[PDB]
Every structure is written in C-alpha cells, then in structure tokens.
C-alpha cells in the first residue's frame, strides 16, 4: 500500500511497517509512534556504517536502512551532447532550444537554494544548532531570487509538479530535469547538479528506512549532506514549502517568503504570536530583520579596627594613630583597642 | 494728496505693528505654540518685522511728509538699521523655507537633527551676517537733506549676498517641495485609479501666494538699486518700490503666521 501524503497520513493514524526517509522518523519517535526494534550484530555487519549513522538518532537505532537516494541532473542525449556545468548557462541554453523539475516539493529546489551556502540547523561540533537557522542568509536569498527570476523568464511553469515533469520528459519535450534513482525505472544520461555562483549544489541525501548512474548519485550525495533527524525538520520542511509556494506563484517577494519560513520554523511561538509576526512582516518589510530578531528573542523566552570601653557607667564595643585618635575623641564625647575606667 | 499719502503710510505702519505684536503675544503666551522648533524662526522674523515698523518706516514716512531729512546726524544710523532689518527679514524667510523643506522631505531626520539649539544658532548666524553687511560698511564709509548715494561694488555685493542668493535658495527649495508634492499626488491618483487636477492646483496656488508676493515686492527695488549706480530712474519709483518691500513685512505674517494654529491662538486670545 502507498497512500497519498504518507508522511502526513502516518502521524494522525498512529501500517505495520512504514517505508519512508529517516528525516520524518525523528518526529515520529519524539512522540512514540515507532517501535524500538532490537537489531542484531550480524544484521548490522551486512550494512554500511554511514547508513547506520544517517538513521541514528539520540544514540539508538530506529529502523533498518534500505537504500541511499540523492538528486541528480537527468538529461536526454538526443537534445544536447553535454550537460551544463553551471546554473548561469541554463537560462541561455533554454532560450536557445525554444530545465524542468518538481516546483511544488521543496526537496527538488532546495539544492539550488543551498548551493550558495544556504543551510538549516547548522552542524557544529558534531551537533545540530536548532537556534541557528540560516535560511535567511545571503546564499539562500541568492538561490531563491535566481529561482524566481528563472521562473519569471518563461523557463519553468509555476504549477508544474513531478507528474507533469515526468510526462514531459518521457515525451522528449524538456531537455533536462532534476531527479533521483526512483525515476530511472520510469524513464539518456545523468550527472551532478550544476554549480551556482561557482559553488556546488548541496542536495539533501534521503536514506530510506523502515555504473555511471550510481556514480553520479554518489557524487551528488557527497557534494551534499545527509538530512538531519531532529523532530524540527518536518515542520521546517513545510515552512520551506510555503516559501516555494510564495516564490514560484509570485504571491510575495523573496524577503517576505524567507521571513515567513523563518517565523514558521520557530515552534515555541504560539499561533497568535506567529500570526502577529506574519502580519508585521506583511505590512512592514523595511524592519523585517528587527522583527525576526525580536521573534528569536521571544523564542528563547517561551522555551520549555575596633574599640572596647569598660567604664563605670558606659561599657560595650564600638567602631593605627589615625584611628586611635578618632576612637579617643569618640570616647571623650561619650563622657583590638580597649579602654577602661 | 500729501495728506492722503500720510494717512495711507500711517495705516500701513499701524497694521504692521499690530500684526507683529499680535504674533509675538500669541507665540509667547501659549506653551504649545513654542513647542514647535520651526516657530522659533517665525519669532525672529516677527521681531525683525517689528523693527521694520519701529526704526525704519516711521522716519522715512515723516521725512517724505516733510519733504526733507530733519533728523540731523541720523541718516547713517537709519540706513544701517534699514539694511540690517531688510537682510534679517530676507534671511529669516530663507531659513524658514529651508526648514519647511527639510521637514517635508525628511521628517524622521528633521525631528532628530533640528533642535531648538540649532534654530537659535541659525538665527544668530543670520543676525550676525545682517549686522556685518549693514553696520560695518556704513560706519566705515564703505557704502559711499540726506539721500545716501551708493557705490557700485558695495551695492552689487549687498544685492548678491542679501537678495539674489537667498532668492535662488528659496526658488530651488520651493521647486523641490513642489516636485515632491506632485510625485505624492500622482502616486495617490494612480492608486485611486487602480482602485476605481485640484490638489496640484491647490499646491501651486499656495506656493504662488507664498513666493510671488515677496518676489514682486522685493525684485524691482533691488533691480533699480543695481541699475542706478551703473546708469536714469527717478527717486519716486524707487521710494514706491521701497514702500512695497516694506509692506511685504506686514504681509509676511499673513502668509507665514496665519495657519490653523495661529488662527486659533488669535481667536482664543482676543
């Protein structure tokens, strides 16, 4: 069985076994939807260690890896002899013929955004930084502005999806697309994704858990990074998705979409505060940076000598010549240094 | 006809005095009027205007009535006071226009940079310039009944530093203000048309009533003062133009001190 929106159907339902990427298993295990199956050493030996590392979370093994998937540039040899090496040359080649991929899912367009340095949940000192969300940096901004510029240049449709892209590529209409190993059974040549601003594309590597093509896939993978396993990924993805729906459709600018994504990523903010920040970013983008700074500030808020006298009538204590003279004056006004009478 | 001339001139002096005194009283009596920094400039202007009606106009009026200059050993100081007051009023108008432009173009920076200290410094600079151009040359015999003939170079320099440059500054200031207002009105009209000229005409009429009055009042006087030394024109027309430039002092508060706030102040004061 393969119900639609499986990643979104499973949470509300919890099938005996689920076959999906490991990035979603984090949120599932955070609430206790997946059963902790006990693995065997003989079963761990027959599998690669990097797969176990990718599927590892909180120091425990959740499910068994099946295979490694990564995006690659699939082009038709009948249309062009060699594939473009840099994104900047696609706008030209395209206009010389007249690239098309899934514009709805953010996983297909994230490589272009992260090519120039876009990142999320930075991996520092061997751990992910949930507070350091760099989806609003210069790299992601350049990637998304280039994406919307290509969309506006009559190069890619704003409503295209995986089905339309596949149907157009099978008929020989489009010259190239971006797809992973799952599209080979339905479909030529495949290669690494083109570079952007000199920097290489960073596609996420989705390891499923419970030859020249493989070479290109592994090269795209090692050029990218493995998807995190923190529960904050799923929601984050949705945020990015909205940005995509806010970028290709032209509903708002790039800065507004990135600010919306940043606000949606913050889980600690309630619904009312989230809507307030969204409206603040809508009605005033001039200070959007300060608004995001205040939103972050609020995110960490809702996160779950002495003298002794022994006279005949006056006795007790009170508080070297510089002090002895003052003590003598005080004693005179009263009618360790000790004085008695 | 001399009697009628006297009547008219006296009426003008009395109206100028009454306007200046009313403006000064309405400004110094209420606190919310002095809260605005720009109003300070107006005060200076008013003060200058007041002097024009006290130490300048009455003496010339009585001299023209009598037909000569009875005030012996007073012509030099009188001409000095006249030049000082004229330069002070012109520079006050110029700085008022500059302040209005700075407030309209960039109000966020105007509210933070323009402070009472800055207004006082500008007023003091204008007064010192007026003094340096009026008293220093006259007392040192550089400008040379009484008629006070004028040299060519000194007259040209005074007309250039006290009328031409401030006039050009005010012209460019009002031009920038008009361009900004026209851009805003065009934006509003485009928005209204997308949602589905009287404002520009009103702005033009306001700018005209503001500038053209002083222009027609003070242009021919300086033109004659610059043409006569080079040579001719008669003294009657020169005196008429001087009286027009002086009546401009009385007309000033009607243009610069007749807004809604000043109207309410005059209504609640009397």
């Amino acid at each position, epitope marked *: 069985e393969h119900p639609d929106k499986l990643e979104e159907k499973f949470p509300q339902v919890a099938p005996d076994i689920i076959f999906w990427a490991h990035d979603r298993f984090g949120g599932y295990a955070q609430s206790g939807l997946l059963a902790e199956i006990t693995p065997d050493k003989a079963f761990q030996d027959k599998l690669y260690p990097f797969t176990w590392d990718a599927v590892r979370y909180n120091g425990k093994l959740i499910a068994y890896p099946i295979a490694v998937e990564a995006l690659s540039l699939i082009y038709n040899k009948d249309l062009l002899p060699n594939p473009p090496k840099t994104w900047e040359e696609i706008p030209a080649l395209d206009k010389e013929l007249k690239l098309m991929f899934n514009l709805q899912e953010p996983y297909f367009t994230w490589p272009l955004i992260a090519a120039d340095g876009g990142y999320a949940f930075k991996y520092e000192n061997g751990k992910y930084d949930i507070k350091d969300v760099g989806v609003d940096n210069a790299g992601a901004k350049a990637g998304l502005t280039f994406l919307v510029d290509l969309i506006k240049n009559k190069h890619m449709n704003a409503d295209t999806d995986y089905s339309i892209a596949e149907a157009a590529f099978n008929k020989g209409e489009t010259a190239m697309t971006i797809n992973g190993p799952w599209a080979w059974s339905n479909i030529y040549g495949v290669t690494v994704l083109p570079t952007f601003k000199g920097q290489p594309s960073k596609p996420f590597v989705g390891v499923l858990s419970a030859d020249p093509r493989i070479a290109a896939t592994m090269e795209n993978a090692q050029k990218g990074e493995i998807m995190p396993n923190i529960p904050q990924m799923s929601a984050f993805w949705y945020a990015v998705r909205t940005a995509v729906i806010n970028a290709a459709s032209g509903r708002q600018t790039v800065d507004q979409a990135l600010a919306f994504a940043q606000i949606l990523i913050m889980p600690n903010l309630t619904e*009312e*505060q989230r*809507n*307030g*920040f969204i*409206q*603040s970013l809508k*009605d*005033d983008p*001039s*200070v959007s940076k*300060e*608004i*995001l*700074a*205040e*939103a972050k*500030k*609020l995110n960490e*808020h*809702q996160a779950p000598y002495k003298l002794v006298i022994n006279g005949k009538t006056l006795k007790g204590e009170t508080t070297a010549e510089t002090a002895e003279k003052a003590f003598k004056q005080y004693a005179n006004d009263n009618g360790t240094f000790t004085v008695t009478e | 006809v001399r009697i009628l001339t006297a009547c008219f001139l006296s009426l003008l002096i009395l109206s100028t005095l009454l306007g200046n005194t009313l403006v000064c009283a309405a400004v110094i009596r209420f606190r919310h009027l002095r809260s*605005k920094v*720009t109003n300070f400039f107006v005060i200076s202007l008013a003060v200058s205007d007041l002097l024009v009606a006290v130490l300048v106009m009455p003496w010339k009026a009585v001299a023209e009535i009598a037909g000569f200059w009875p005030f012996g050993s007073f012509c030099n100081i009188w001409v000095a006071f006249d030049i000082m007051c004229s330069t002070a009023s012109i520079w006050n108008l110029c700085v*008022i226009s500059v302040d*209005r432009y700075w*407030a*309209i173009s960039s*109000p*966020f920076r105007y509210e933070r940079k323009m402070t009472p200290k800055a207004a006082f410094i500008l007023i003091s600079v204008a007064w010192t310039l007026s003094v340096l151009i009026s008293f220093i040359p006259v007392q040192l015999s550089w400008h040379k009944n009484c008629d006070s003939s004028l040299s060519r170079t000194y007259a040209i320099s005074s007309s250039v530093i006290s009328f031409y440059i401030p006039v050009a500054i005010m012209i460019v200031t009002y031009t920038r*203000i008009y361009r*900004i*207002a026209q851009k*805003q*009105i065009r*934006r*509003i009209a485009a*928005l*209204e048309r997308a*949602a589905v000229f009287k*404002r520009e005409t009103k702005v033009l009429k*306001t*700018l005209s009533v*503001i500038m053209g009055v002083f222009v027609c009042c003070w242009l021919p006087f300086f033109i004659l003062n610059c043409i006569l030394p080079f040579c001719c024109i008669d003294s009657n027309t020169f005196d008429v133009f001087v009286w027009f430039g002086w009546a401009n002092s009385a007309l000033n508060p009607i*243009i*610069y001190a007749f*807004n*809604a*706030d*000043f109207r309410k102040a005059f209504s609640t004061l009397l």
Partner: nanobody
Amino acid sequence: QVQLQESGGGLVQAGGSLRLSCAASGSIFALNIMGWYRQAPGKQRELVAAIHSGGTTNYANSVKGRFTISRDNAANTVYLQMNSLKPEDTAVYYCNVKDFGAIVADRDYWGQGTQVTVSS
C-alpha cells in the same frame, strides 16, 4: 474637520499580540505623517511609531521590531501591530496626524487615544 476613530485597545496577557486600528475621516493632504504615541499615568507622552505618505516608517529604540505601524492605500486607515507585549507597555495610545496642508506650518490632529493594559 478631521475625525480619528481609534479601536482595538483593551486587556491582553503579556507576550500576546494586539492590532489597533485608527480610521481617519475627512479631507487630508497627500503629504502627511500618521503616528502612534503612548502616554502613561504620571509619565510624559513619548513616540512609539510613525509612517510617512511615501512608505517610510520610523520606530523608537524601545519598540523597534516588536511594534509595527502601517497605513492603508486609500482608506487612510492606520494599523498598529504589537507583539511580545511587556508590562511597561500599558498606557493610553494616541494617534497623531501631522498634516502639511500649509507648507509654512503643520497641523496636528488627535483622536483622544485608547487605553491598553498588559497583564502579568
């Protein structure tokens, strides 16, 4: 005459959001500034936010990023969003409309403001 009808103020828990709205009825010149000020009992009236007809906005150093002012396209309706409210934000919020109809001066219109209380 110009009338300013303000609304949206009231009681709100700390950290919540609130949207105040001021409707300006009457003939207003193009060049005009619309701002929100706050006055607390005992203290003096201080500036909170302001916006010019050209789209530029200005905020105080204590409400920068937290508060956001905006104006409508043609309705001349001023909106003020406040997020992450603090206990020291309770005050009477007034709407100041500075009109430059007379180029030689400016006219200030107020709408008596409305009360805003932040709980703790």
